């Protein structure tokens, strides 16, 4: 058992997964003053038009909206990416309070939550083989501030009551992930890791400058979820976020001047 608890939290993940103290760990603080613009970065392509959501599920760490990744239906191309990355699932990390909840920070500022859209490089045939490579995954990370409710998010919130406890899942079809994007795809990028065990250093990170607004009403529904399984003592699913890890020698490239 790993989690976000006192004894099984990020400070202790290294005991079971030594890579936690690796050279390419995520998330990281994005220093705007030192994250230099890169004119070599190609424009970012997002094709979520024929996207096919299948189910939503509680996995005892967050909730994942999973997609049919059998075809190039919903793909991420260009930016820093070489080849086509298929969307497999998106999930969030969020806090107990509005003041915290994001994994990545910007000049040390935390957001109320962070959205991660997970893609894998079709070059490697399947996800299993993908996570064993440095460029295997691409995660599109989008900050959440508490403001005007996100319409594209309400379909998600409306189903959360039905996957309260770890292990529960539900049919979740015809979800448009375009509903969750901001207007400017202006990003930072760097090579990093999964922010959960086994913390494999296989992720090209693409973090959007532009956060999205969500209503306190929407984020309160997130915090009504359970880490625990059915029949267990209740443990509310909150502060499911890893703090910023050392950047070390890595450079964070910005897509904008
Ligand atoms: Zn994540």
Q: Which of 203, 215, 150, 157 is nearest to 178 (CA)?
A: 150
* Distance from Cα 94 to the centre of ligand 1, integer Å: 10
Q: Answer yes or no: are the C-beta atoms of 30 and 252 closer than 8 Å.
A: yes
d(CA 19, CA 13): 9
Looking up tokens 């990416």 gives 81
Q: Is 104 annotated as a binding residue?
A: no
Q: Answer yes or no: are the C-beta atoms of 196 and 70 closer than 8 Å.
A: no
Catalytic residue among 1, 61, 104, 119: 61
Task: Specify burial of residue 132 (Cβ count, 10 A radius: 0-12, 13-18, 19+).
Answer: exposed
d(CA 93, CA 62): 7
* Distance from Cα 151 to the centre of ligand 1, integer Å: 22
d(CA 96, CA 82): 38
Q: Is 34 annotated as a binding residue?
A: no
Q: Which of 240, 216, 229 is nearest to 116 (CA)?
A: 240
Q: Answer yes or no: are the C-beta atoms of 99 and 41 closer than 8 Å.
A: no
Residues with Cβ within 8 Å of 195's Cβ and at least 6 positions away in sequence, in order, are 26, 27, 93, 103, 116, 241, 242
* Distance from Cα 116 to the centre of ligand 1, integer Å: 5
Tokens (6 digits) for 12:
């202790």
Task: Specify burial of residue 43 (Cβ count, 10 A radius: 0-12, 13-18, 19+).
Answer: exposed
Q: Answer yes or no: are the C-beta atoms of 226 and 164 closer than 8 Å.
A: yes
d(CA 144, CA 51): 22
Domains by residue range for the chain, with CATH:
1-257 (3.10.200.10)
Strand partners, 106: 30, 109
SS (H, E, C) the chain: CCCCCCCCCHHHHHHCCHHHHCCCCCCCEECCCCCCECCCCCCEEEECCCCCEEEEEECCCCEEEEECCCCCCCEEEECCCCCCEEEEEEEEEECCCCCCCCCCEECCECCCEEEEEEEEEHHHCCHHHHCCCCCCEEEEEEEEEECCCCHHHHHHHCCHHHHCCECCEEECCCCCHHHHCCCCCCEEEEEECCCCCCCCCCEEEEEECCCEEECHHHHHHHCCCECCECCCCCCECCCCCCCCCCCCCCCCEECCC
Q: How many CB atoms lie within 10 A of CB 3?
A: 17
d(CA 130, CA 118): 12
Q: Which of 101, 102, 97, 54 is nearest to 74 (CA)?
A: 54
Q: Is 12 annotated as a binding residue?
A: no
d(CA 219, CA 96): 10
* Distance from Cα 228 to the centre of ligand 1, integer Å: 19
d(CA 142, CA 209): 8
Q: Which of 96, 219, 90 is nearest to 147 (CA)?
A: 219
Q: How many CB atoms lie within 10 A of CB 23?
A: 12
Pairing of strands 63-67, 85-94: antiparallel
Q: Which of 206, 196, 201, 228 is nearest to 92 (CA)?
A: 196
**14 annotated active-site:** no
């Amino acid at each position: 058992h790993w989690g976000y608890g006192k004894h099984n939290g990020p400070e202790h993940w290294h005991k079971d997964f030594p890579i936690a103290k690796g050279e390419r760990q995520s998330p990281v603080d994005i220093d705007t003053h030192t994250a230099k613009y890169d004119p070599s970065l190609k424009p970012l392509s997002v094709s979520y038009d024929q996207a096919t959501s299948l189910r939503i599920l509680n996995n005892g760490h967050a909730f994942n909206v999973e997609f049919d990744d059998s075809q190039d239906k919903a793909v991420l191309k260009g930016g820093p990416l070489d080849g086509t990355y298929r969307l497999i699932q998106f999930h969030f990390h969020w806090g107990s309070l509005d003041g915290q909840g994001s994994e990545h920070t910007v000049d040390k500022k935390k957001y109320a939550a962070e959205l991660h859209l997970v893609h894998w490089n079709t070059k490697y045939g399947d996800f299993g083989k993908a996570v064993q490579q440095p460029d295997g995954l691409a995660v599109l990370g989008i900050f959440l501030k508490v403001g005007s409710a996100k319409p594209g998010l309400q379909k998600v919130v409306d189903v959360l009551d039905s996957i309260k406890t770890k292990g529960k899942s539900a049919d979740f079809t015809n979800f448009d992930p375009r509903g969750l994007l901001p207007e400017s795809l202006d990003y930072w990028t760097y090579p990093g890791s999964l922010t959960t065990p086994p913390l494999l250093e296989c992720v090209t990170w693409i973090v959007l400058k532009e956060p999205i607004s969500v209503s306190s009403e929407q984020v309160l529904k997130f915090r009504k979820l359970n880490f625990n399984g059915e029949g267990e003592p209740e443990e509310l699913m909150v502060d499911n976020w890893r703090p910023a890890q050392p950047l070390k020698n890595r450079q964070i490239k910005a897509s904008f001047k």
